Structures are given as structure tokens and as C-alpha cells.
Paper text:
Histone lysine methylation is dynamically regulated by methyltransferases and demethylases (KDMs). Two families of human KDMs catalyse the removal of methyl groups from methylated lysines on histone tails in a sequence- and methylation-state-dependent manner; the flavin-dependent lysine-specific demethylases (KDM1/LSD)6 and the JmjC-domain containing KDMs (JmjC-KDMs), which are Fe(II) and 2-oxoglutarate (2OG)-dependent oxygenases (KDM2–7)78. Although the catalytic domains (JmjC-domain) and active sites are highly conserved, all KDM4s remove the repressive H3K9me3 mark, but only KDM4A-C are additionally capable of demethylating the activating H3K36me3 mark. In conclusion, we have used in vitro selection from a ribosomally synthesized library of cyclic peptides to identify natural product-like inhibitors of KDM4A-C, which act via a previously unidentified binding mode and which have unprecedented selectivity and potency.
To investigate the role of Arg6 of CP2, which binds in a similar manner to the H3Kme(n) residue, we substituted it with other residues; substitution with alanine (peptide 4) or with hydrophobic/uncharged side chains including N-ɛ-acetyl lysine and citrulline (peptides 5, 6 and 7) leads to loss of potency (IC50>2,400 nM for KDM4A). Inhibition of activity is regained upon substitution with positively charged residues (lysine (peptide 8)/N-ɛ-trimethyllysine (peptide 9), IC50=24 and 12 nM, respectively, for KDM4A). The relevance of the crystallographically observed orientation of Arg6 in solution was explored using the trimethyl-lysine CP2 variant (peptide 9). Despite the lack of similarity between CP2 and the histone substrates, N-ɛ-trimethyl-lysine-CP2 (R6Kme3) was efficiently demethylated by KDM4A to Kme2/Kme1/Kme0. A co-crystal structure of CP2(R6Kme3) in complex with N-oxalylglycine (NOG, an inactive form of 2OG) and KDM4A supports the productive binding conformation of the CP2(R6Kme3); the acceptance of CP2(R6Kme3) as a KDM4A substrate unequivocally demonstrates that the CP2 series does not compete with 2OG. Notably, KDM4A was also able to demethylate methylated Arg6 (CP2(R6me2a), peptide 10) to the non-methylated, inhibitory CP2 sequence. KDM4A can both catalyse the demethylation of CP2(R6Kme3) and CP2(R6Rme2a), revealing its potential for modulating both lysine and arginine methylation status in non-histone sequences. The different sequences and binding modes between the well-established histone substrates (H3K9me3/K36me3) and CP2 suggests that KDM4s might be more promiscuous in their substrate selectivity and binding mode than presently perceived.
Author numbering:
A (entry chain D): 8 to 354
B (entry chain H), H (entry chain F): 3 to 10
C (entry chain C): 5 to 161, 170 to 354
D (entry chain G), F (entry chain E): 1 to 13
E (entry chain A): 7 to 354
G (entry chain B): 10 to 354
């Protein structure tokens, strides 16, 4: 509902494209971060892989069938594990008459069908598959080696976590989706669409994110009492109509093949896949994320929930505040509009 | 199981 | 045998104690009255009999693998997925099942409660304490002890063992016959009622046809996908396509007998506990030979019929081994043992 | 994965 | 004056003499064969009851018996323990294995000694009392299925059949399986035909000395005789031939080869064992001479379901003269075990 | 119990 | 020590707590022989009289036929007509079945192994019932209150003879074959009245040897079933154990005396004359491992199996997942006593 | 019948 929280898309030059962290700083100087979601179109000359011809034999070890229950625009999604399969088998199912994309004339019709048939004919989503489709030598925006301060966790403490500091492959089909969530530890996210049908995203500006979770708490009270950050479980789906009804601002955007998508700290997002496709994703950070990580509210009802130590980041970047924070008396309040400090060159 | 796509 | 129970309706029996004492003889008797033609029958034991003095010492019982029943579908066509949950005691289950979130909605008549079930079974998925190895019968009970029925099924010695089912509102069981088209016995120890739907075995094929029409992918995947017990079909669909069926509500203290090749389904009204097992009679042997089994995985229930063919049909053993034993089952005919009643 | 339980296929993660 | 020594006789009927079973029984009895209580008949070489025996491997034996024996010094008791049904091919597999195969020996006396020595050890299984026939339908000569004997009246009148008496029985034998001292039910006639396999050895006590055996048996099993009037009809009592020698019971022994018939005559006590894997078919039958035997037969009194044939129809149809006397418990007629069957008049 | 066949007493359990 | 069978004479105060006293005798090494005798206080009586049990029914008496030679025998239990205790007593004390004349135990044992295949006697085994009076709270076989009860408390399943009491009416020459308890459980046996019951025990430490020996002497049986001794049909004479070096001990149980078998303790025996014993299985924490490792009969579906899930998770949480995964590799040292015995050491 | 005292 806010003009200044609106999703921006960018068309960098090759020269601009070669330095990732700098260009992230640049889009923050343009206000992109304020929408919680930015789209980056890479130059025509850039290809992360010569061909996708050699992936049909690839294995999806733990495919999931997404059963959805709910009504009146509120839903809960249960991920049921399925037998491992290859991308060939998965492709057979994805283009089948039962699971193929429905016929439509405009995007709005496909959105209507998505929210209309969400709970019917549950699709299989090949989510969370370890791997990268980048060629190892490619230095331009290689999700496998993004080289940003997040590496402190692996370089400073040698801790390996799937998806956050390692690349993740997502093989989608029609009606597969991701619930309303922010990254673990409220980090940044990078998502590249290698090939296939589009993926559509809903975004809520971080400035209003608290409102959203407040609303969520009200509509899933029994879930909220068990865990305050129950949205971290990525099981809650909320419809655009319901956001408008309760005055939550949001934007939407459609991501096509060969395009990049960036989520910014504390930017709630959800979405769904138009058809058979493949994406590669990881998390990343800037200096501005540090405060976000210090104040991140996490799930406390799971053993394996992602909890990262912020000690080293503070010591390396906020020494003047370190001992006070480790003391626990640090009450700095975040301003979501502020671009990252690495935009000094800009601004 | 706990995985990033969510609770499994 | 076609004269008995021509309508193929569900029959309810009221044996005396004298009649009750011999389980297999009473099964043969109810078949001599044509009960089996319905695929489902109800036995009401005499008020004097009790399997257990009280059900107030069962809180420590454990449900190792409770399942949450997520149901997806519309227009009377649904697919149920049972998700394994954390173990819990009967006491915990009783607390949850009585909670305002899961408790039995308010209704006056049965038709209203059924309506709510078919309207809301997709929402607020419930928890079912099913497939629990155990028993609530006291050790000394020798009448109709689901634990040790001692039918010819024991010649294979899973199937002849007792199971417990702790139900809450709108937990349900999908359309199915028994593994190997066996018999089943169900006793409701306590709690809210359990409603059933049944198709006369004579008309079972029609159900299968209709089911294959509604889930073609499942039918291509598997010959007997109903054996997965994930398929739910409302009575309004059955009646919409001319399929004969009947309904019965089982109360606490009542027995339900399902007969070979009798498709049944249903749902629980609220918190209750039932005990059940599979069993056989001589009449089941042919059904066991002609049963169409699940093909798509290794751990589907399969019983070798060789032992039964040797003991009860020696003269046909050779014929049966050569694949030349094509004999037609007459569903109306009662079990051989029923001769003394016919 | 899945298990063939009595009440049908049981889904366990 | 015919076969005064009561020794087991063998007959070699021509195919012509083979046509009428009852007639040839009359003949062998006209020769004194019945005095031994057991006879052997060798059918003509050209005769065959069954063209081939290779299509029976899947025949089901419903109640195999594991034959457990206890005893010492030539006295033994046999308990038959039921086992689960098995096919003929499984039975033959077990019979020919090392565990149960026939031991290698030089002469018959060696196998007889080893049988009596090892009788209690390594109990064999006996495929006994199997309902069925291996006769082909078209065989009109000596068909155990349809012997056309006066005994067939029992079914015709009462309408009740007695398995193994009015109907055929099959026996699949292995080494050391044995049948205990006994006479046929109601003291009837017996017919046994060895279809294939190893031989079957028999011991036979002539009817004229049956009582002596009985006396001896009661002395050696006093408790059993207290419990029942005819405990030998339980078919559990085994008595070695050396015990019979020691106590003066006359007997003879005979070995039946494949393709051969053995006839047991009324009140002729017999026993024996099988050398190895074999198959025999058997049933009961009767002649006029049997009627008197069946009237005075002493039956098992400790069981309600023992074989009992009503004699009233036989007496009414063949003994009009004494239905009144016998029916009034006054027919004191003695039985001469020597005398042949009436039907032997045409030969005597 | 016991069942009396033509071959004698047969003992079944 | 010497792994010989031990006998204990508790005070009434010691006797009151069953599990505690079991733990004590194990703290004394009683469990190494595989068999221990407990003599109860003289004052203690389980039943006021044994005159009102004459019309008790023995549903399935078994006649024990034995075949074999040279100390190796196989036993076959043939079911007979049901009879009352009175009829059984009359048969057992009759001349045909009564105990031969003997002067010392060694002679009677000699006569047993000599006459084992002759004059098969009738054994009134496996009779559901108890002879304890209703309010006897000490050493009551019906309600021993050990951790074994957990299974029934969680599922309600009961196995007769394991979780419930069995009565055995014996006569001369009736015998029980070499065996361990189902699931390698503990056993408690009490002789109510009548003539004595003789026992042979092999120490658990040497259990495997006995199995090897049995397997060698009954090769076919061992091919069919992994644990063929669990059919309880194999009898082996003491002479044959000595010849092949199996260490064993013997002991005779008298009326009013308790016998306790310990996990993986192979034992066999025979009755001297007409008598009545009551027994059942029980467990301790030490048993849990034994149950996890027990080699069970593989040829029959009707055989006794107990799920250890409840035991492992409640008493061995640390290994549960590992165990459930199948990765637990604990080696049982049969020398060690029960945990609950800590208070004595 | 599977019994404790052995195979009956
Ligand atoms: O691809 C998906 O299903 C979900 N992706 C994300 O939430 C992301 O890339 O940040
Ligand atoms: O009780 C249930 O949930 C299912 N019952 C049956 O399918 C039955 O008893 O045959
Ligand atoms: O074949 C057997 O085992 C026994 N036969 C007979 O006793 C007979 O034929 O009369
Ligand atoms: O008493 C018997 O006959 C047998 N007893 C046992 O094997 C025992 O108590 O462990
Ligand atoms: Cl909620
Ligand atoms: Cl209750
Ligand atoms: Cl489908
Ligand atoms: Cl005697
Ligand atoms: Cl062997
Ligand atoms: Ni995300
Ligand atoms: Ni059912
Ligand atoms: Ni005979
Ligand atoms: Ni024992
Ligand atoms: Zn949580
Ligand atoms: Zn299937
Ligand atoms: Zn008798
Ligand atoms: Zn076994």
C-alpha cells in the first residue's frame, strides 16, 4: 500500500555485475531494501552454465508432497516426505495431466486458480536439494561462493549449515509454494531461476513485518503459544485478500528464468511456482544485517532450529558495543529504511 | 525433520 | 441362500449367553440368516457380559505411533494422509480429544452430525490412536476374546493379534476390504459411537469400478489401490452413481462383524476406544485364493494359501497349483459350517 | 518415508 | 486235509482266472489258503492298474503319522503322532534322504534284524489312511475301488460309508514304518496291492491259533486288557517274532513285492513293516463265510466310535434259518476255521 | 485328543 | 564361588521384599550357577491346606514319549484326555507308574537315565491357575511385581505362563528338557507338595558350549530352527555333558522350597513322584540386555516374543535410538550381578 | 499347540 516500499527491479551492466557486495550496497542506496524484495536481471552476456542437458539423471533425495488444510484465506501446509526420485521422474509428474500448469490467459487468472485450488491435488516439491548448477569457475554471482561476511561462521568457526552457507536446489511444479517467512537469523537471501516456468513472490516491507506476525499470532493462537516464532516452521499460508482486509501492505512480482531475486533482512515473503522449474538459493549478509541478527526472534520448540552465534560479528564490527551487548544491555532500535553502511561510495 | 523448506 | 436377506441389509443380532459362548458357531448362525450379504453385521452381547470391570485404569497405556489425518479433496472425493506423530499415553490423548479445538460439535440428530463430518473433514485435522498392539479384555474372559479367537486363521501361525483404536471426533477409516479379504471383528469398549458405511460384497466390483473412475492415476499405479486405505468417498457420491450401500452406528458395548470382500468405511463421533482383529472361517478360503493384492511395495500384507488348500481342499491342490482352479464365488451362499442352521 | 501399517500407509518423516 | 500246516501260499492266476475276484477267492480258499490267514496273489504280467505313476507327486497326504515306539525285549507299543499335510513328493524326498533311507544290507534276515533292533530309534513318518485310489476307471479286474462283494450291502442298506472298509485307502511308506498286530475291523477280509516302490514284509498267525496270540498279548499288557476287551484293535501293539517262538505261537512270514496282492482272511492276525519308500492301496471285503465271523467278532469296548457293522441284514439275507435263534441270543454255533467259503462248492 | 482310523489310534494335538 | 548352585535361608524380614532379595542373592554370586535355591521361613505357608484341590481339572495332560540312546534323547508330548487331580494321583501312585525302590539319589538318577524311554508317564503341565491364597503378599507367583509387568501396563498383553502362573502336577519319570526361559527371562518355581524335583543347571557363562554340543548332535534340528532347544524336546544325560566337558551342577528341590532360574541358564530335570509345582517368569534390570540379545525360535509364528521397546526406552534411553537403529553392541558379562544390588556391595 | 513345556 506504500509507494516507497515497492518492489524494484534492476538491470546492471557486466561491469557493475562483477562485484556482488558492492551492487547489493548500490540497490540499498536506491531504496530497494525498503520493499523487502528486489529483482536483478543479469546482463545478456552472462550464463552461469553452458547447458542444463546433464541434470536429468540427478537425484532428489527427499521430495515432499505439500498437503494444505484451511479455508477463508488462511492455511497450514504439511510437508510429507516421499520416495527419492530423479529430475526425469519428477519432470514426468510435473508435466502430467494431473499436475501440469492449468490453462490461463493472464497472470491474474493463474493467481486466482492458485488460491482457489490450494488444498486440492497436492504437488511434489523437490526442495532443499544440496547442490549447485553454476560452473565452478564462474566468478559472477556464484551462489556457491558468494564471499561475504556470512563466511565468518565457516571461516571463523568452521560450522556447516545446509542452505545458509551452502547452495540449495529447488525443483518446482505447478502449485508448489513457500509459506510466509523470513530467513533464519533474519539474514539476506539470494535466489536464481535457472530454467523453467516462473515463480511468483509476495513481499511485505520489513517496516510492517511485525504487524504481519501480530496478525498471524491472532489467527493461529494455539500455534503461537507453543512457539512465538511459529512462522519459522514455514507452514503458514496467508492470502493476499486477507492481507488487504487487515491493512497489511504488500507487493507482488513474477520471476522468470535467468532472473535473480533478493530478500532483505526481516522481509516476510511467500510465493508459488507456475510450473516445472529449478532454482538455486543461499543466504548472505552485509554489515547492516548484524543488528538484525542480534535481535532476531527464533523458534524455541525444535532441536535442529538454526541458531547462529553473533559474538564474532559484533567483536569484528561493533567492538564499542560488544562488551555492552555480551552484558545484555544493548537496546538499539533498528531503522529499516537505512541503507547498508557499505554504500559509502554511493549516497 | 528440521529442514529449511520447513518442518518436515 | 438367495432367499435369505434378499435386500442385503445390515442385520443386528441379540444372542443369549448360551448362544454367545461359542464364537464360530454364532458366526455360522448369522450367516445362515444371510447377514454376510450386507458385508457388515452387528452383534449385541447380553447385558450381563463384560470384557472388563472398568476402564478407569487404562491411562498409562501408550499409543506408540499416533497419526494425524490430513484430508484433501472435494465433491465427496477425498484422499487421507496419516502422518506419524510423537508417542503419547491414553491420558494425553483423552485430554486433547476432549479439548474445545477437537471435541465433538453440537448436534441433535445423527444426520446433522454426519453432515458436519462430510462438510468439515478436510479442516482441523484430528489425531487417531490407531493400530496399537494391545487388548482391554481381562485375562479370564473366554467369550469373544478378540485376542485369542482361535479360528482357522491361526493355521498361518499380525492378523490374528488384537489391536486398539483410540478415536476422537471425525477421525475416519477409508473404504477398504480386509487384507486377504478376511473377516474382521470390532468391539467398542467405551466412549462415543462409531459410524459405518458398507457395500454388499455382491456389489463390491461396482465400487471398485467407480473408484477407478475417480482416481485413474492411482489405478494405473496399482491394481488394488484401495488397499492403501487412503480413499474416502461420501454416501452422496455412492447414491449419485447408483451404488447400493447401507449405514449403521455402533455404540459402546457392541460388536461389528465385517465379512470377506465387504467394503466399509466410517468415522468416530468423539473420544472412544475399540478393539479389533482379523479372522477366518472355511468360507473365507476361496476369497483368500481369489484376492487381488497391492502390487507397488514389499510390505503389503500377503498370506500364503497353500496351507489352507492342503488341509481343506486336497482334491483341488494340484488344480490350484497349475493355475487351472477358476471357480466362481457366490456371495450369498453361507459358510459350510452353517449346514446345521439351513 | 512410508510404512505399511494396518490402517493404511503411514507417513513418517 | 488241505494245507494242514497253514503255510502262506502264493497263486499265479491266468488272466482268465483273474476276471472274477470272488470266484478266485473261493478257489484259493478251496485250496486251504485261509488256514495261514494270509495269502499272496501274483497277477498276470500284462495286467496294469495304472498306466503311469509320474503324475501323483502333488497328491496330498492329509495326516502323516510320526511312528513313535516304546518298549524292550521284543515288546513294544506304537503311538501315531499326526503331522501337517504333505505332498507325495515331499514324503518321497524325506524317505530317500540319509536320515530315513533304507540301510544297506545283504540278506532279508539282516534287514529284519535291523528293523527289530532300530524300531524305537529315529521314528519314521507313514503316509497312512489316505482316501483315494490309483486305479484307472477302466480296470474291471481286482479293482479295489469296486470289488463287488456282499459287503457292499452295508452302504446299500444303511447308506453310511466306512472309510477304509467300504472305500479305498492309500499308504505311502518309508523304511521302518510298521503296522501292529491286528485283525481287520469286524474280522473282515483285507486286500492290499503294492502299486510301486520297495517291498512290504508281513508276519501272519493262522486264525486257528489267534486266541493264543491274544492270550499272550493280554499277559504282556495286562493293564491294557483290563481297559478294553479287544485292545489289539487299537493297532498299537508290536510283538517280535522271537517272542512268538519263545511262547509257541505259530506264524509264518512273507514279503510282498511291487505289483503283488496280499489277501488277509477273517480273524487272521498279521503285522509287518515296509522296506522303504513305497505305495500300497487297500480296503476290506467279505464273503459268505465271513458272516459268522462278523457275528461273533469281539470289538473294542473302550471307544464309542469304533467300527461296528450291523449283521442283521446279512443274517436276514443269507441266514434265514437262525435269525430267530441268533436274534434271541441262542445261536451257539461254533466256527471251524478250517472250513472254506461255501462258494467253493463248485471247486470241491 | 485321539481319533481312531483304520491304522489305529491317531493322536492329534 | 566355583559357580556351584547355592541355597539361601532368609529371615521373614528379608523374605518380604522379593526383588530386593533376588538382588541380594545375586550380590552373592547365585546367578553364576544359573540356578539358586531359596528355602522360605518355616512359619510362611502359601496355602492353609491342599485338600480342596482334588477336583481341579488338568485340561491337556501330556504323555511323554522319549526316543534316543547313548545319552541323547528327543521328547514328544502327546495330548491325552482331560482328568482331575484325583485321577492323576491315582495313576501316579499306582504300581505301573510309581517311583521304583531306591536307597540314595544316585541310584534313582541312574534308574531315570536307564528307563527314560520306557513306560511313558503322564505330566499335568501348563495348568492355568495358582495355589496361593488370596491375601499372601510374600513371594506370590501370581503377582510378583517386577519390571516385567511394564509390557502389560502399556498394552495389556498377557502371555500365559510368562506373565501368569502355571501349575505342574508331576509323577515319576516326568521331565523337562534342556532349555532357557522364553526371551531368556528369570524363572521362579515353588514345590507346593509331594515328592521332590531334581534339576541340572549349566552356568550361563558356558551356555554357548551346550548349544554347540546340541547343534552338533542334532544337525537337522539346528538347520530347521536357530534356537531348536526352545522347543524343549532335547534331553542330554549328565554323563554326556561330562564326556564333552560341559560343566554342570545338580540339586534336588523338596516340598516347600523355591528354585530360581537366571537369564541364559540352561536347565533340565525330572520328578521323583507325584507332586505339584507353581511357576512363572520375572525380570530385573539386568535382564534387559538378555532380552535384546535372545536368539528366538525361527520356525513357528506362535512362539513367545516380547517387545523390548518399552524396556530399552524406559531403562536404557541412552542407546534407544542407537538400539532402534540396530547399532547397539553390548557384550553381556554373565559374571556381573544386578544393578539393584548396589546397596549390598 | 505352542506351549511352554514344549511343543504339545
Ligand atoms: O524456492 C523456494 O521454495 C523458497 N525460496 C526462498 O524462500 C528463498 O529463496 O529465499
Ligand atoms: O476402527 C477403525 O478405525 C477401522 N476398523 C475397521 O476397519 C474394522 O474394524 O474392520
Ligand atoms: O499297509 C498297512 O500299513 C497295513 N495294512 C493292513 O493291515 C492290511 O492291508 O490289512
Ligand atoms: O516344573 C517344571 O516342570 C519345569 N520348570 C521349569 O522349567 C522352570 O520353572 O523354569
Ligand atoms: Cl492455532
Ligand atoms: Cl474411560
Ligand atoms: Cl488420481
Ligand atoms: Cl500295560
Ligand atoms: Cl536331527
Ligand atoms: Ni525465503
Ligand atoms: Ni476394516
Ligand atoms: Ni490289516
Ligand atoms: Ni524352565
Ligand atoms: Zn517453534
Ligand atoms: Zn498398491
Ligand atoms: Zn478299546
Ligand atoms: Zn523353532
Amino acid at each position: 500500500l506504500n509507494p516507497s516500499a515497492r518492489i524494484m527491479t534492476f538491470y546492471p551492466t557486466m561491469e557493475e555485475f562483477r562485484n556482488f557486495s558492492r551492487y547489493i550496497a548500490y540497490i540499498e542506496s536506491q531504496g530497494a531494501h525498503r520493499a523487502g524484495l528486489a529483482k536483478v536481471v543479469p546482463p545478456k552476456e552472462w550464463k552461469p552454465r553452458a547447458s542444463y542437458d546433464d541434470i536429468d539423471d540427478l537425484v532428489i533425495p527427499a521430495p515432499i508432497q505439500q498437503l494444505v488444510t484451511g479455508q477463508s484465506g488462511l492455511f497450514t501446509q504439511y510437508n510429507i516426505q516421499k520416495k527419492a526420485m530423479t529430475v526425469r521422474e519428477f519432470r514426468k509428474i510435473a508435466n502430467s495431466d494431473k499436475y501440469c500448469t492449468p490453462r490461463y490467459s493472464e497472470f491474474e487468472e493463474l493467481e486466482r486458480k492458485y488460491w482457489k485450488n490450494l488444498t486440492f491435488n497436492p504437488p511434489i516439491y523437490g526442495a532443499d536439494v544440496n547442490g549447485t548448477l553454476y560452473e565452478k569457475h564462474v566468478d559472477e554471482w556464484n551462489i556457491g561462493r558468494l564471499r561475504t561476511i556470512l563466511d565468518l561462521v565457516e571461516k571463523e568457526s568452521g560450522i556447516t549449515i545446509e542452505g545458509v552457507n551452502t547452495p540449495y536446489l529447488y525443483f518446482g511444479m505447478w502449485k508448489t509454494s513457500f509459506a510466509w517467512h523470513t530467513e533464519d537469523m533474519d539474514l539476506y537471501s539470494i535466489n536464481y531461476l535457472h530454467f523453467g516456468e516462473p515463480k511468483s513472490w509476495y513481499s511485505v516491507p520489513p517496516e510492517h513485518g511485525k504487524r504481519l506476525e501480530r496478525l498471524a499470532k491472532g489467527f493461529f493462537p494455539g500455534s503461537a503459544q507453543s512457539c512465538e516464532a511459529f512462522l519459522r516452521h514455514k507452514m503458514t499460508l496467508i492470502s493476499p485478500l486477507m492481507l488487504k482486509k487487515y491493512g497489511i501492505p504488500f507487493d507482488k512480482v513474477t520471476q522468470e528464468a535467468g532472473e535473480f531475486m533478493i530478500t532483505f533482512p526481516y522481509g516476510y515473503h511467500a510465493g508459488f511456482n507456475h510450473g516445472f522449474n529449478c532454482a538455486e538459493s543461499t543466504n548472505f549478509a552485509t554489515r547492516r544485517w548484524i543488528e538484525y541478527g542480534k535481535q532476531a526472534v527464533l523458534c524455541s520448540c525444535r532441536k535442529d532450529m538454526v541458531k547462529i552465534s553473533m559474538d564474532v560479528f559484533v567483536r569484528k564490527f561493533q567492538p564499542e558495543r560488544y562488551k555492552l551487548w555480551k552484558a545484555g544491555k544493548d537496546n538499539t532500535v533498528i531503522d529499516h529504511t537505512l541503507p547498508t553502511p557499505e554504500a559509502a561510495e554511493f549516497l | 525433520y528440521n529442514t529449511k523448506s520447513g518442518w518436515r
